[PDB]
Amino acid sequence: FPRVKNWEVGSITYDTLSAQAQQDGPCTPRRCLGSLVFPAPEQLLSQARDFINQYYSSIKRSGSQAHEQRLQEVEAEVAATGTYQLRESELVFGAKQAWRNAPRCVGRIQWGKLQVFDARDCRSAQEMFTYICNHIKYATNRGNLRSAITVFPQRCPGRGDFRIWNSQLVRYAGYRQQDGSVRGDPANVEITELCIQHGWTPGNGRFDVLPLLLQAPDEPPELFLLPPELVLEVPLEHPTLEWFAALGLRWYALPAVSNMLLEIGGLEFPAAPFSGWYMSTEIGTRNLCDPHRYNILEDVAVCMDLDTRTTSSLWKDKAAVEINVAVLHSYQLAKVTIVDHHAATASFMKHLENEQKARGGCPADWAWIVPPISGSLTPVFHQEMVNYFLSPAFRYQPDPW
Amino acid sequence: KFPRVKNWEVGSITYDTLSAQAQQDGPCTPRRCLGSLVFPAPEQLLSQARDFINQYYSSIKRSGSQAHEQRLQEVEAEVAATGTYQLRESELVFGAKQAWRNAPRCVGRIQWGKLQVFDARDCRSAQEMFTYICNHIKYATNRGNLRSAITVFPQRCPGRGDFRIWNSQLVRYAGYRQQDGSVRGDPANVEITELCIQHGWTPGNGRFDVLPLLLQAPDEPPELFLLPPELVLEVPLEHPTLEWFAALGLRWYALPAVSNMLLEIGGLEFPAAPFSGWYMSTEIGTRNLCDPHRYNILEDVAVCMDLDTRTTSSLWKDKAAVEINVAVLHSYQLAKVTIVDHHAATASFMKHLENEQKARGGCPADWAWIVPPISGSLTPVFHQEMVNYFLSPAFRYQPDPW
Ligand code: HEM
Ligand code: HEM
Ligand SMILES: Cc1cc(N)nc2cc(-c3ccc(OC(C)C)c(CN)c3)ccc12
Ligand SMILES: Cc1cc(N)nc2cc(-c3ccc(OC(C)C)c(CN)c3)ccc12
Ligand SMILES: Cc1cc(N)nc2cc(-c3ccc(OC(C)C)c(CN)c3)ccc12
Ligand SMILES: C[C@H](O)[C@H](O)[C@H]1CNc2nc(N)[nH]c(=O)c2N1
Ligand SMILES: [Cl-]
Ligand SMILES: [Cl-]
Ligand SMILES: [Gd]
Ligand SMILES: [Gd]
Ligand SMILES: [Zn+2]
């Protein structure tokens, strides 16, 4: 039982929940790979028995009652048909628990408040597209953002999968030219290539909202242009640097990830887009300052009249800080839910303590919980953490080409 | 089947084949990662001795030599007669450099080849020990143009106690606990400050009182030694535009000289081998000055900057922290004391990684420690995957002697 210390307060705790991790991670006694970004159907049933067993413990009702009853229904269902279906409340419970188990997610204090949209009755691309549009609309809620997941039909043995091709529902275009240089977001250059290749008309410049590429079983994907009024955007302005607005920067309101596989009780949902709200360093630091994303840091520094000649003026640090001030300020002015990295990390500490009392620990990936700016100014920096895999879980999955 | 490490900023891929040589075992298992933990006979003394000799003779492109095989037989014959063996002077110089080269949390390893190695294996008393240390400090400081050095005191041997330096660094500021339950000076050094006083040191009452050295000879109580004031170079901290900053009375010392780690070379152990380089400015500005459990000046800085303390979303902590680091860099450059900022440091560490991959097929690096504690993703090391493992020779932590 790993002894875990907080070096700011001197507290000690023991992670007993780690003793129930299963699906092996990438590390060995010889070497740690914790910094890596990507590390006979009989086993379907054993994964079902354990998932159901914590469901009934979670509602006290383990032993007696329909706890016993529900074990046979799945026993018999897999025996006849190979797969099984989850009850609606189980699917709600599995969604929340996989969020609760995401080691790299700093917003998990919120894991109990999740709206689950059951789309297992789906059978078309246009049927997915309307389901996605209800998600975005409900989740955006005019800027008072609400966590949401939409779950599409579970993969069946034989016959294909539902699968969104965009990494997120809202992503900006990436265009090349002669120079190999990119106009727009370089992270989304390939998916933009696959959008033109499927009959999309390209666009003006930096911030062209990509059309969705949705793929029902077998028959290939089809474009679906997003309606401009439901893709909510925030134009970036700075509270005191008057010239910042004229840089024409924007970002969208809703981070909505659409390329991960949800696993509950042994079933795989390759299309199950979830969404919440942004922590501001994701926008200001990673999306806009990363050298391989929009890469704006130098431009903001020239406007601030900073000494770009020598690294020891910390012009990069001054300019990054003001970009984040502009992100927070613009989202608030537009009344869109956003959280700063200090508030978010302070809440995650609170979640660590709750999770101690409840389950005896919490899988947490230190490199991803610590913010990408001002790391040691946040309480999670000085907090040792244990990373391991629990189920239910969100998992990465190969892209479909 | 060697780990594939990717650089995400540019798209590089290499495989760490050096990790397959990791002749120790860390705290991670397939079932859980413990990478963020701060703290993770003759037959085997022989196998480590043989491995180090093999290394040394490969580095002088003399592997498999008669001189190589002779040296193996000599060490095997010496652990037979005495249970231990002695390093040659050149093997000791090589081994200290390798230990620096192999330290996974050190971002300054680009410099690993330029290390001045003082052999103090003939040291006999705490008094001589003080003399070797003073000369280490004088050489390393070099009037502000700082040089990398290590002094090696006698190895651990059976039938005699260890040379130990009780202080964690050669230069540290006292920390006096108060009636408020508070601490004047550096809170991290409250323990050593009590130890010094209970071994007969007259305390001060400032926030930057340099602590005496507690120096333990074999089988002796620790002996207290006060450093000549003119040996400890100090940098008063001022800000290039914020003039009230100078009136905080902040200072820091020039020379980071770690003195409580164990140096291990081919199975031999050197529990007293203090080493020193130069500071990266974030160690001073972000950690030593802004950590809540250290000097904790951040709120006081931000209040004076007229920032909005009542809410986190003003990013008052980030802004105050960046100006404290500006003050550190400017103060050290004003005083002509060597210093490196985290952008220069991480850029050169990337060159180190490239140099190391060509030479040994990899490099042990601890991502959570290589990434600076501010502005992480503004540096190239943030986007570089790394593999953490333990190669030997090596610096290791060891328990406090008390
Ligand atoms: C409501 C506020 C939320 C915030 C502030 C938040 C924040 C974050 C952040 C900052 C990351 C790091 C990714 C990166 O920086 O590249 C992350 C990853 C992640 N988040 Fe959250 N998130 C929120 C809601 C949710 C919801 C509703 C879910 C699932 C239903 C979720 C699941 C995940 C997953 C699965 C990952 C990556 C998984 C992993 O690698 O462990 N988050 N989140
Ligand atoms: C010349 C300039 C040097 C710089 C800029 C530098 C930088 C650093 C930094 C920033 C740390 C971590 C501090 C922290 O985490 O708060 C570190 C750790 C360390 N450094 Fe260096 N260092 C230098 C020289 C040296 C030398 C000369 C040696 C030994 C001969 C050395 C050996 C180590 C070791 C053993 C650690 C701890 C590593 C571990 O625990 O795995 N460094 N260094
Ligand atoms: C619900 C949610 C809210 C939020 N506020 N943020 C989120 C960030 C990610 C996420 C996951 C992986 C990932 O990276 C993969 C390429 C490994 C990235 C960007 N790197 C973001 C996923 C979900 C998020
Ligand atoms: C030669 C040198 C130069 C420098 N510029 N910096 C250095 C920092 C450390 C060091 C080592 C460990 C450590 O922490 C514990 C694991 C003991 C800390 C503070 N976190 C600093 C050690 C040596 C350093
Ligand atoms: C998770 C983490 C990352 C990092 N990058 N650094 C860290 C440094 C410390 C830490 C805390 C106290 C401490 O020292 C006590 C003996 C006062 C030392 C060593 N001096 C290190 C603890 C955790 C750290
Ligand atoms: C190499 C390194 O592991 C990689 O760049 C990681 C580091 N930590 C991260 N943390 C978050 N939240 N998001 C990221 O994309 C990354 N990138
Ligand atoms: Cl994003
Ligand atoms: Cl220090
Ligand atoms: Gd101007
Ligand atoms: Gd001024
Ligand atoms: Zn690990």
Swiss-Prot record, chain A:
Residues that, per the record, bind L-arginine: Q168, W277, Y278, E282, N287
Expression sites (tissue/organ): Platelets, placenta, liver and kidney.
Residues reported in the UniProt entry to bind (6R)-L-erythro-5,6,7,8-tetrahydrobiopterin: S35, R286, A367, W368, F381
Effect of R395C: Found in a colorectal cancer sample; somatic mutation
Binding site for heme b: C105, Y396
Binding positions (Zn(2+)): C27, C32
Compartments it resides in: Cell membrane; Membrane, Caveola; Cytoplasm, Cytoskeleton; Golgi apparatus
Ranges for region Interaction with NOSIP: 31-401
Entry's family note: Belongs to the NOS family.
Assembly: Homodimer. Interacts with NOSIP and NOSTRIN. Interacts with HSP90AB1. Forms a complex with ASL, ASS1 and SLC7A1; the complex regulates cell-autonomous L-arginine synthesis and citrulline recycling while channeling extracellular L-arginine to nitric oxide synthesis pathway.
Summary of the function given for this chain in its UniProt record: Produces nitric oxide (NO) which is implicated in vascular smooth muscle relaxation through a cGMP-mediated signal transduction pathway. NO mediates vascular endothelial growth factor (VEGF)-induced angiogenesis in coronary vessels and promotes blood clotting through the activation of platelets.
The protein's name in its UniProt record: Nitric oxide synthase 3
